[PDB]
Design an enzyme around this catalytic site. Structure first.
Site, PDB file in Angstrom:
ATOM      1  CB  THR B 292      -0.948   0.081   1.215  1.00  0.00           C
ATOM      2  OG1 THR B 292      -0.255   0.525   2.408  1.00  0.00           O
ATOM      3  CG2 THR B 292      -1.633  -1.252   1.508  1.00  0.00           C
ATOM      4  CG  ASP B 293       1.210   5.925  -1.151  1.00  0.00           C
ATOM      5  OD1 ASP B 293       1.977   6.206  -0.202  1.00  0.00           O
ATOM      6  OD2 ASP B 293       1.108   6.678  -2.134  1.00  0.00           O
ATOM      7  CD1 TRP B 294       0.874   8.167   5.548  1.00  0.00           C
ATOM      8  CD2 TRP B 294       3.045   7.632   5.457  1.00  0.00           C
ATOM      9  NE1 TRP B 294       1.461   8.640   6.701  1.00  0.00           N
ATOM     10  CE2 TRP B 294       2.796   8.317   6.674  1.00  0.00           C
ATOM     11  CE3 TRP B 294       4.351   7.211   5.169  1.00  0.00           C
ATOM     12  CZ2 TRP B 294       3.809   8.589   7.605  1.00  0.00           C
ATOM     13  CZ3 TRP B 294       5.354   7.478   6.107  1.00  0.00           C
ATOM     14  CH2 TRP B 294       5.071   8.174   7.295  1.00  0.00           C
ATOM     15  CG  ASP B 296      -3.546   4.874   0.621  1.00  0.00           C
ATOM     16  OD1 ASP B 296      -4.528   5.671   0.547  1.00  0.00           O
ATOM     17  OD2 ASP B 296      -2.414   5.167   0.204  1.00  0.00           O
TER      18      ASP B 296
END
Ligand SMILES: [Mg+2]
Ligand SMILES: [Mg+2]
Ligand code: NA
Lengths: 752, 763
Positions: B292-294, B296
């Site tokens: 994932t991104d931060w 998310d």
């Protein structure tokens, strides 16, 4: 599903008996529509009518002779000549169409209403119905039985020059007012439209108002859920009310011209909705398939693609050669006779529904005495009043009072062109002050109401007269600013009328949403006089005014209220009428932060987990639904039953609304919903119902709204409708109530 | 039906993965899928008391040893550190990881233009600049250098390349990718992946690092231009344009991918099993690690409300195909994922596949046998002059000469030069965001040894010939960089007096640094103060070289007529001042070309690959589309101090089918008086198609260096299938009919003789 329009065996027997008699030449001619120019020598040419209609069998003519409004008598004698050749040589009456899109656009003397964006702001279904009923009566008075209206494109981009032709940015408003418009034009029996009513035409199917760039006729990029849930919904809704015809969007989505999109034209629309009406192209759009978009190599292939996709009639609109090329398509097997026969069946059916075989002409000299009457104009003025939105009114500056010396300034202060916008007497609206000077500008109506001695005109900024192409619609110029400021010093209140001059379609494309620099400078300089300013926004698009709004104690958006908008505005500014309009779109603040009201939670600033009080105020000059009255309304006691519900239920919503001020006034009552959690992230708010009521001072009324549970469904990621178990909030004014759906319902049919 | 594995099948590797997996407890499994930033391992009080980064060994013991967390990310204190400071920290993390878990930690950093978060490392131009170079080999060499200098920190993973298409000029992440074009991002993304990882994805040695494509996908197309607001991408664009650079760089063997934080058609990408699992992992047969991104997974329930709580959000994302959650703060993620497993919300088969993908990546990087390595000895080229030379050449090749009337450039000896504008004396301006800090807002404070535009100009032209008087000044940033857009007039009158005394004015304008949502804008125009500056400078009558120093193409149409020369430097990094001084002196020749459309008007935004209906005034049967009314400078714009002539375009076979590969040859001649490079761009147009055809599409490019008078044949290979398009039904098709190929002002017609319709999702 049941037919959109009721099944009528006698009607179908007439259609099929006539079809069986026709030659292929007559069939392809019925599918061909030309404008009046090929018949024009206003003088028409009898030899041209005999050729176009008699030899080439053309079945429909459209548009204003010489592309400018004409009297009913001039239309009547022209159409009498057309019908004489049609009945004698073909035995099938001509179908004449006009774009009568806010009252009689192309009939001199007729009743001109506010544009549809204004009618959206009225939130008033019955008043919308009354306007198109008047338009129908006045159009039949020209021997014309068909208008290409209502336009129900969603206004999804503030830069689009056709922003003002629809009922605004909201799905439900366009669906409901589109239905009211169809009902007004056609009356209550789609299978028998009498000689006071006309065929309606929904346009422009669909997503035409969502071009990515805002430029007219450039690609949209509409999401799967949005296409069905929002763009299709007003067309589906007004199809259900029996509209006789539909016109297709000229543009492109996902690389596909709509005029070639069999899935959307045939499957989604004619088949899924079981709709037996007549589907017409927009102007020259079969040509566009090969010339503009290059999805076809030549006109023959373009005709075959459009007709096979579901088109019934081509607005060619100049070339009888369409008939030869369509016959070639049939002869070469490019289009099957079944498709020709079905297209002609739909055209004939429409002609029979209008009573045109039995009455191809009628008594236009005798049966339409109310044409252009003051009684009709009273409805236009009421529509105009109810459309104007009081956006700001600090310190009770409005209504104005006796004694006050008023200065009228700005380029929109003394112009009928400015009040009407495009689609008024000419396509661009660019000759309205020359063609119909008898109507009242804002200045003339203000001088009459408040007294010539109390109202001074000094524009400060002026529009030039349009060239023939209206290429200079955006131009304005300073005109003795010094004198104007001196006049402002001598007055008590300044009414500054700014916005846009008239334009229409692509000639009206813009490159920057800001109000013009001269008009910004005008209001800033007026403000330095220290006099209070009433800022009147007179425009088709919501041009940016964030740098001058802080300078104006009061702000009124009149949009494009038409010939009776000056009269209406003077009554409101005087307090004879009470403001009740509400913005039917989001008014943006900044050129590169454009939003609509039905946005996603991630777009909100600051909202915490478990809260639903979303905030877009830093980006929105005024929100959808903005608007205040000269009186105050209090909402209380929001009730919803059953509070636990499933798809088969109808919710009964009740809200109490009291006039707690000192003036009678109307209040539009808008009900929103929010789905608190969903498999697709849920729109922060959706308008689900509205009503409008009139209340005496102190009067309290309970408003009851009925909301099917299925209206809380949404189109999920797979493109299907679903109503999900879980909670919702309903909102009316500052009241809210929580409800719960107890069971998920997934539809397998394309429509709910 | 199945395509070959994106990365070669390695029996020995899979054996190591499966033997390790079979020994692991459930606690260790969910720990491997948990990624935290360095902050929970940082002793905050003792960091603040000393000012130096201090880590907490008891926190390492708890986070790694007890909760079994398998990955740490980010710069300690979210500020760049020395390699030595990283190494001591990672040595302590690995000691606990190997002793308590037996699985090495995987440390990741966002090293996205050289070593973003490593003090003293080589900082390159941003990717938008590398797009402008059209130079695969420089791009590859830059990420090789970044990989070397990142391993010197004991870090084996960068969250890069970013290959989002730059489809909206207002997006604050516009400059993080290689520009608006599909083929550029595909080709330079592949070059970047190859540079970082080397040529064997199953054995990444200790001078290379794992790469990570981001942000999958359509992240750079928000409708409004605002970061992390919905896109609305059409069915043909999603596969043909947004997916394609990810497809291409997967074939080059990328180890990992990070998902788009945002939303398309109402669907968060982090919840989209169709795109994460079916389009990507399955269809491409890709055995890599999806992160994932931060935060998310939190966003799914908090921001987007497609889940009611974090447990449900975790299950949704893991079941959709996520392998690792960048949580990035809460060890309690492991407890919640364990709850998902015990409640049957996530099957063990999905846990075991996710852990297999994480273990596989750790073995590929050699981390079990080498969790740490000899950082003190093995990286003597860290921060070397050799590495800086490559950064300076990439900066040079990126800068775009957009206008140069009257041979104003190159400048000459004897000219008194005034440097004006708020970008004239700032390393923050040159680098933009993602430099030493996330917002880039401390770069002049943290790294004053690098040369600003003014400093580099003074050194090259002589300190006595170069004067600084800005006229407009950016304020120093607050901690949140909330004032990145602000600027102020700064004694304009004195600057105008300085201009009257100079011979040429080099006015440096554009943007200050910003990154992600803090950088959102509301109007694309250049700031009013900077517009006024250039207008008032122009009234002195002196010639102006207008230098555009910015992450986004801010509108400059009102001041472009006042400038005799215009240079777009975008964000060229620490060696961009040095590069610009060389170009303006004529030591180097301009060769950059715009990798995006530069707009003119705030509400008339367009890209180069538009549809015919958007062109003004094109006649039937003609293919010379025109949008100059709406474009300040088009994609591919750029001029040189010399001139180049194109001739003798030939294509074989000119009648082709889908099995053919076209050989395209164009002759290019330097017809001016100076040596220079020329990027050679090959476009196509499908003359008629079942979906209306993009007016131009870039299909190939090369770049060559030519002496004066020298002609050279450039040969380009074009698979016939590269002329297919994604039709309305979402499927690729190559249709019988004619195309035009274009190179310079030359064109050649070719004919596909048979339609080919694909049934597979990819060509
Ligand atoms: Mg729900
Ligand atoms: Mg073709
Ligand atoms: Na320095």
């Amino acid at each position: 599903v049941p037919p959109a329009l009721p099944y009528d065996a006698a009607l179908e027997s007439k259609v099929q008996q006539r079809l069986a008699r026709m030659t292929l030449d007559e069939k392809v001619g019925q599918m061909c529509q030309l404008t009046a120019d090929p018949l024009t020598d206003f003088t028409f040419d009898p030899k041209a009518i005999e050729r176009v209609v008699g030899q080439y069998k053309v079945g429909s003519i459209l548009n204003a002779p010489l592309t400018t409004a004409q009297t009913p008598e001039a239309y009547a004698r022209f159409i009498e000549a057309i019908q004489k050749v049609s009945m004698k040589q073909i035995g099938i009456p001509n179908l004449y169409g006009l774009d009568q899109n806010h009252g009689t656009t192309y009939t001199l003397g007729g009743t001109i209403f506010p544009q549809n964006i204004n009618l959206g702001a009225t939130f008033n279904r019955e008043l919308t119905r009354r306007s198109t009923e008047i338009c129908a009566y006045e159009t039949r008075a020209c021997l014309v039985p068909w208008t290409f209206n209502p336009t129900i494109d969603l206004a999804r981009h503030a830069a689009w020059p056709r922003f003002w032709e629809n009922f605004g940015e909201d799905t439900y408003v366009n669906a409901e007012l589109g239905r009211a418009a169809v009902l007004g034009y056609q009356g209550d029996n789609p299978n028998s439209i009498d000689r006071y009513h006309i065929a309606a035409c929904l346009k422009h199917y669909m997503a035409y108002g969502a071009p990515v760039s805002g430029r007219d006729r450039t690609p949209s990029s509409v999401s799967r859920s949005d296409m069905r849930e929002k763009h299709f919904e007003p067309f589906r809704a007004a199809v259900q009310s029996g509209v006789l015809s539909i016109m297709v969007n000229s543009g492109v989505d996902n690389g596909m011209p709509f005029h070639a999109n069999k899935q959307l034209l045939t499957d989604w629309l004619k088949r899924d909705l079981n709709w037996d009406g007549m589907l017409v192209t927009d102007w020259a759009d079969i040509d566009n398939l090969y010339k503009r978009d290059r999805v076809a190599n030549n006109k023959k292939e373009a005709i075959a693609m459009a007709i096979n996709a579901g088109i019934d009639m081509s607005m060619d609109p100049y070339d009888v050669g369409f008939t030869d090329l369509l016959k070639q398509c049939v002869n070469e097997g490019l289009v099957p006779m079944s498709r020709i026969d079905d297209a002609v069946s739909r055209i004939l059916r429409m002609k029979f529904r209008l009573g045109l075989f039995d009455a191809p002409t009628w008594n236009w000299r005798r049966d339409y005495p109310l044409f252009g009457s003051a009684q009709h104009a009273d409805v236009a003025r009421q529509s105009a009043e109810e459309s104007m939105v009081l956006l700001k009114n600090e310190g009770q500056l409005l209504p104005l009072r006796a004694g006050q010396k008023i200065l009228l300034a700005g380029p929109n202060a003394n112009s009928l062109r400015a009040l009407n916008g495009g689609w008024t007497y000419t396509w661009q609206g660019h000759r309205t002050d020359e063609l119909a000077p008898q109507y009242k500008t804002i200045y003339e109506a203000m001088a009459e109401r408040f007294g010539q001695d109390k109202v001074t005109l000094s524009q400060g900024v002026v529009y030039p007269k349009a060239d023939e192409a209206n290429s200079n619609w955006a131009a304005d110029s300073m005109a003795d600013l010094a004198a104007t400021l001196r006049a402002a010093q001598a007055a008590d209140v300044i009414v500054a009328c700014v916005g846009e001059n008239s334009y229409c379609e692509t000639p009206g494309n813009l490159t920057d949403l800001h109000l013009s620099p001269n008009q910004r400078t005008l209001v800033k300089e007026l403000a330095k006089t220290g006099k209070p300013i009433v800022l009147v926004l007179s425009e088709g698009r919501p041009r940016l005014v964030g740098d001058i709004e802080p300078l104006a104690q009061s702000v009124v958006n009149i949009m494009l209220p038409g010939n009776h908008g000056g009269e209406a505005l003077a009554r409101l500014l005087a307090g004879d009428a009470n403001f009740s309009g509400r913005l039917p779109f989001t008014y943006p603040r900044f050129a590169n932060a454009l939003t609509t009201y039905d946005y996603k939670p991630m777009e909100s600033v600051g909202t915490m987990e478990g809260n639903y009080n979303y905030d877009a105020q830093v980006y929105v000059q005024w929100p959808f639904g903005a608007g205040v009255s000269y009186t105050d309304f209090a909402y209380s006691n929001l009730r919803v039953s059953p509070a636990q519900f499933a798809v088969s239920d109808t919710l009964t919503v009740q809200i109490d609304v009291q006039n707690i001020g000192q003036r009678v006034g109307k209040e539009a009552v808008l009900l929103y919903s929010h789905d608190l959690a969903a498999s697709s992230t849920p729109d922060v708010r959706r308008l689900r119902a509205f009503d409008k009521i009139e209340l005496q001072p102190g009067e309290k009324r309970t408003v009851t709204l009925r909301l099917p549970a299925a209206d809380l469904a949404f189109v999920g990621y797979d493109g299907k409708w679903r109503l999900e178990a879980g909670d919702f909030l309903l909102f009316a004014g500052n009241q809210q109530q929580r409800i719960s759906c107890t069971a998920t319902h997934l539809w397998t049919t394309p429509n709910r």
